[PDB]
PDB file of C-alpha atoms and ligand atoms in Angstrom:
ATOM      1  CA  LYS A   3      37.313  25.795  -8.343  1.00 50.38           C
ATOM      2  CA  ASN A   4      37.047  28.425 -11.175  1.00 52.22           C
ATOM      3  CA  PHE A   5      40.533  28.741 -12.864  1.00 52.77           C
ATOM      4  CA  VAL A   6      42.654  28.216 -16.059  1.00 51.36           C
ATOM      5  CA  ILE A   7      46.426  27.530 -16.550  1.00 51.40           C
ATOM      6  CA  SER A   8      48.377  29.136 -19.470  1.00 48.48           C
ATOM      7  CA  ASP A   9      51.830  28.081 -20.818  1.00 50.42           C
ATOM      8  CA  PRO A  10      53.788  31.334 -21.511  1.00 49.14           C
ATOM      9  CA  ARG A  11      56.636  29.240 -23.123  1.00 49.57           C
ATOM     10  CA  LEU A  12      54.211  28.640 -26.094  1.00 50.08           C
ATOM     11  CA  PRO A  13      53.108  31.349 -28.603  1.00 49.13           C
ATOM     12  CA  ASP A  14      50.590  33.940 -27.222  1.00 51.43           C
ATOM     13  CA  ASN A  15      50.306  32.257 -23.758  1.00 50.83           C
ATOM     14  CA  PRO A  16      47.660  29.580 -24.589  1.00 48.99           C
ATOM     15  CA  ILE A  17      45.287  27.903 -22.028  1.00 48.64           C
ATOM     16  CA  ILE A  18      46.621  24.300 -21.458  1.00 46.86           C
ATOM     17  CA  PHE A  19      44.094  23.416 -18.644  1.00 46.09           C
ATOM     18  CA  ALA A  20      40.593  24.777 -17.719  1.00 46.12           C
ATOM     19  CA  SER A  21      38.585  23.617 -14.613  1.00 45.80           C
ATOM     20  CA  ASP A  22      34.992  22.238 -15.081  1.00 44.55           C
ATOM     21  CA  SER A  23      33.658  25.319 -13.126  1.00 46.69           C
ATOM     22  CA  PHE A  24      35.344  27.621 -15.750  1.00 46.53           C
ATOM     23  CA  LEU A  25      33.709  25.728 -18.710  1.00 43.69           C
ATOM     24  CA  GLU A  26      30.367  25.912 -16.766  1.00 45.51           C
ATOM     25  CA  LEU A  27      30.684  29.708 -16.024  1.00 45.17           C
ATOM     26  CA  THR A  28      31.929  30.620 -19.581  1.00 47.34           C
ATOM     27  CA  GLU A  29      29.615  28.069 -21.395  1.00 43.96           C
ATOM     28  CA  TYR A  30      32.533  26.958 -23.696  1.00 47.58           C
ATOM     29  CA  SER A  31      33.514  23.251 -24.156  1.00 50.73           C
ATOM     30  CA  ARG A  32      37.098  22.153 -23.189  1.00 48.73           C
ATOM     31  CA  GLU A  33      37.767  21.481 -26.956  1.00 52.00           C
ATOM     32  CA  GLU A  34      36.937  25.175 -27.808  1.00 51.27           C
ATOM     33  CA  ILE A  35      39.302  26.466 -25.006  1.00 51.78           C
ATOM     34  CA  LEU A  36      42.579  24.428 -25.354  1.00 49.32           C
ATOM     35  CA  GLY A  37      45.238  26.462 -27.278  1.00 51.36           C
ATOM     36  CA  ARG A  38      43.431  29.895 -27.100  1.00 48.31           C
ATOM     37  CA  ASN A  39      44.614  33.051 -25.230  1.00 49.22           C
ATOM     38  CA  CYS A  40      41.995  33.935 -22.525  1.00 52.32           C
ATOM     39  CA  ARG A  41      41.310  37.372 -24.199  1.00 52.96           C
ATOM     40  CA  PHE A  42      38.311  35.804 -26.129  1.00 57.03           C
ATOM     41  CA  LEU A  43      36.287  36.353 -22.855  1.00 56.13           C
ATOM     42  CA  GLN A  44      36.677  40.164 -23.434  1.00 56.65           C
ATOM     43  CA  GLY A  45      34.219  42.227 -25.554  1.00 57.13           C
ATOM     44  CA  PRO A  46      32.799  45.718 -26.324  1.00 58.71           C
ATOM     45  CA  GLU A  47      32.162  46.640 -22.605  1.00 63.29           C
ATOM     46  CA  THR A  48      35.614  45.367 -21.349  1.00 61.64           C
ATOM     47  CA  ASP A  49      37.616  48.361 -19.917  1.00 60.36           C
ATOM     48  CA  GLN A  50      40.821  48.472 -22.097  1.00 61.57           C
ATOM     49  CA  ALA A  51      42.584  50.413 -19.250  1.00 60.92           C
ATOM     50  CA  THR A  52      42.112  47.289 -17.002  1.00 60.26           C
ATOM     51  CA  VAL A  53      43.280  44.928 -19.865  1.00 58.15           C
ATOM     52  CA  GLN A  54      46.511  47.078 -20.046  1.00 59.30           C
ATOM     53  CA  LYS A  55      47.187  46.462 -16.271  1.00 60.27           C
ATOM     54  CA  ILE A  56      46.959  42.641 -16.933  1.00 67.61           C
ATOM     55  CA  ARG A  57      49.474  42.999 -19.859  1.00 64.22           C
ATOM     56  CA  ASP A  58      51.960  44.862 -17.535  1.00 65.41           C
ATOM     57  CA  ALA A  59      51.557  42.130 -14.814  1.00 66.74           C
ATOM     58  CA  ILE A  60      52.271  39.319 -17.391  1.00 66.95           C
ATOM     59  CA  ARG A  61      55.308  41.343 -18.724  1.00 66.88           C
ATOM     60  CA  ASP A  62      56.718  41.896 -15.154  1.00 68.08           C
ATOM     61  CA  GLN A  63      55.500  38.380 -14.059  1.00 69.03           C
ATOM     62  CA  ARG A  64      53.806  39.857 -10.902  1.00 71.03           C
ATOM     63  CA  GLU A  65      50.496  38.705  -9.313  1.00 70.28           C
ATOM     64  CA  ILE A  66      47.492  41.082  -9.831  1.00 70.89           C
ATOM     65  CA  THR A  67      43.758  41.380  -8.931  1.00 72.31           C
ATOM     66  CA  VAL A  68      41.325  43.368 -11.188  1.00 72.20           C
ATOM     67  CA  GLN A  69      37.523  43.440 -11.819  1.00 74.70           C
ATOM     68  CA  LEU A  70      36.349  43.566 -15.504  1.00 72.52           C
ATOM     69  CA  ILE A  71      33.316  42.616 -17.700  1.00 68.71           C
ATOM     70  CA  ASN A  72      33.658  39.235 -19.540  1.00 69.11           C
ATOM     71  CA  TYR A  73      31.304  37.433 -22.028  1.00 69.79           C
ATOM     72  CA  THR A  74      30.123  33.758 -22.155  1.00 70.92           C
ATOM     73  CA  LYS A  75      29.775  31.756 -25.454  1.00 72.40           C
ATOM     74  CA  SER A  76      26.111  33.019 -25.670  1.00 72.01           C
ATOM     75  CA  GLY A  77      27.355  36.634 -25.103  1.00 73.07           C
ATOM     76  CA  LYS A  78      26.011  37.104 -21.515  1.00 75.76           C
ATOM     77  CA  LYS A  79      27.928  39.931 -19.694  1.00 73.88           C
ATOM     78  CA  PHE A  80      29.310  39.000 -16.207  1.00 74.30           C
ATOM     79  CA  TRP A  81      31.743  40.878 -13.872  1.00 73.90           C
ATOM     80  CA  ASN A  82      35.007  38.872 -13.343  1.00 75.83           C
ATOM     81  CA  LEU A  83      37.079  39.484 -10.175  1.00 76.38           C
ATOM     82  CA  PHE A  84      40.239  38.072 -11.868  1.00 79.31           C
ATOM     83  CA  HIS A  85      43.362  36.939  -9.882  1.00 79.01           C
ATOM     84  CA  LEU A  86      46.591  36.197 -11.875  1.00 78.74           C
ATOM     85  CA  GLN A  87      49.521  34.306 -10.205  1.00 74.67           C
ATOM     86  CA  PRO A  88      52.869  33.549 -11.925  1.00 79.45           C
ATOM     87  CA  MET A  89      54.270  30.014 -11.220  1.00 78.08           C
ATOM     88  CA  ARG A  90      58.028  29.168 -11.345  1.00 76.47           C
ATOM     89  CA  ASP A  91      59.910  25.790 -11.307  1.00 76.59           C
ATOM     90  CA  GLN A  92      62.692  24.851  -8.764  1.00 74.61           C
ATOM     91  CA  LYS A  93      65.281  26.909 -10.804  1.00 74.96           C
ATOM     92  CA  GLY A  94      63.012  30.037 -10.483  1.00 72.67           C
ATOM     93  CA  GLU A  95      62.173  30.024 -14.257  1.00 74.83           C
ATOM     94  CA  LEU A  96      58.511  30.973 -15.075  1.00 74.21           C
ATOM     95  CA  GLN A  97      56.611  27.725 -15.977  1.00 76.17           C
ATOM     96  CA  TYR A  98      52.877  28.751 -15.867  1.00 76.62           C
ATOM     97  CA  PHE A  99      50.318  31.466 -15.110  1.00 74.18           C
ATOM     98  CA  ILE A 100      47.217  30.425 -13.099  1.00 76.52           C
ATOM     99  CA  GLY A 101      44.131  32.667 -13.589  1.00 76.78           C
ATOM    100  CA  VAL A 102      41.345  32.424 -10.932  1.00 79.00           C
ATOM    101  CA  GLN A 103      37.915  34.007 -11.767  1.00 78.47           C
ATOM    102  CA  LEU A 104      35.102  35.006  -9.310  1.00 81.27           C
ATOM    103  CA  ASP A 105      31.704  35.940 -10.919  1.00 85.32           C
ATOM    104  CA  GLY A 106      29.893  39.075  -9.565  1.00 83.93           C
ATOM    105  CA  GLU A 107      30.078  42.931  -9.321  1.00 84.15           C
ATOM    106  CA  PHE A 108      32.118  43.096  -6.029  1.00 84.18           C
ATOM    107  CA  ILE A 109      33.155  46.812  -6.447  1.00 84.46           C
ATOM    108  CA  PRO A 110      30.069  48.888  -7.502  1.00 84.69           C
TER     109      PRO A 110
HETATM  110  C1  FMN B   1      46.112  32.268 -16.928  1.00 84.51           C
HETATM  111  C2  FMN B   1      45.440  33.481 -17.528  1.00 84.51           C
HETATM  112  C3  FMN B   1      44.073  33.675 -17.355  1.00 84.51           C
HETATM  113  C4  FMN B   1      43.440  34.793 -17.898  1.00 84.51           C
HETATM  114  N1  FMN B   1      42.109  34.952 -17.709  1.00 84.51           N
HETATM  115  C5  FMN B   1      41.458  36.020 -18.210  1.00 84.51           C
HETATM  116  C6  FMN B   1      40.006  36.207 -18.013  1.00 84.51           C
HETATM  117  O1  FMN B   1      39.345  35.367 -17.365  1.00 84.51           O
HETATM  118  N2  FMN B   1      39.421  37.290 -18.545  1.00 84.51           N
HETATM  119  C7  FMN B   1      40.117  38.203 -19.251  1.00 84.51           C
HETATM  120  O2  FMN B   1      39.513  39.191 -19.714  1.00 84.51           O
HETATM  121  N3  FMN B   1      41.454  38.100 -19.470  1.00 84.51           N
HETATM  122  C8  FMN B   1      42.169  37.054 -18.994  1.00 84.51           C
HETATM  123  N4  FMN B   1      43.553  36.919 -19.222  1.00 84.51           N
HETATM  124  C9  FMN B   1      44.247  37.975 -19.970  1.00 84.51           C
HETATM  125  C10 FMN B   1      44.402  37.688 -21.464  1.00 84.51           C
HETATM  126  O3  FMN B   1      44.824  36.340 -21.688  1.00 84.51           O
HETATM  127  C11 FMN B   1      45.426  38.636 -22.081  1.00 84.51           C
HETATM  128  O4  FMN B   1      46.729  38.298 -21.593  1.00 84.51           O
HETATM  129  C12 FMN B   1      45.097  40.096 -21.763  1.00 84.51           C
HETATM  130  O5  FMN B   1      43.877  40.419 -22.446  1.00 84.51           O
HETATM  131  C13 FMN B   1      46.209  41.085 -22.116  1.00 84.51           C
HETATM  132  O6  FMN B   1      46.940  40.683 -23.268  1.00 84.51           O
HETATM  133  P1  FMN B   1      46.515  41.205 -24.728  1.00 84.51           P
HETATM  134  O7  FMN B   1      46.732  42.699 -24.651  1.00 84.51           O
HETATM  135  O8  FMN B   1      47.481  40.492 -25.641  1.00 84.51           O
HETATM  136  O9  FMN B   1      45.074  40.776 -24.850  1.00 84.51           O
HETATM  137  C14 FMN B   1      44.226  35.800 -18.673  1.00 84.51           C
HETATM  138  C15 FMN B   1      45.595  35.601 -18.839  1.00 84.51           C
HETATM  139  C16 FMN B   1      46.224  34.484 -18.301  1.00 84.51           C
HETATM  140  C17 FMN B   1      47.708  34.317 -18.509  1.00 84.51           C
END
């Protein structure tokens, strides 16, 4: 339900699609999201060490799961259990990343 799709073939891996649940959770309108990198959800309290692990996963085009603090439009802190999956065409060329979010502090 709660997910976005980025196009890594376009500059800085912009969000091309965002699910209604995502717009609801993050409090942003679709118009504010389309063409942005998803890093705008990060903020002061976001562990940079965890952000680095996401950068490595995108570089190596591997799937990853991490928990990190994210901010809504209004600046409300929420824990994001974030799941990144690379997505390839028939020829095995990377086409998209899908990013699934789950809201809550799962690991204390
Ligand atoms: C499909 C997709 C969804 C993403 N969703 C989130 C997210 O919900 N929260 C977040 O903090 N970062 C998310 N990211 C990570 C950022 O977009 C960015 O790649 C990350 O912060 C590391 O790159 P940077 O060092 O250039 O910021 C997502 C990335 C992709 C490709």
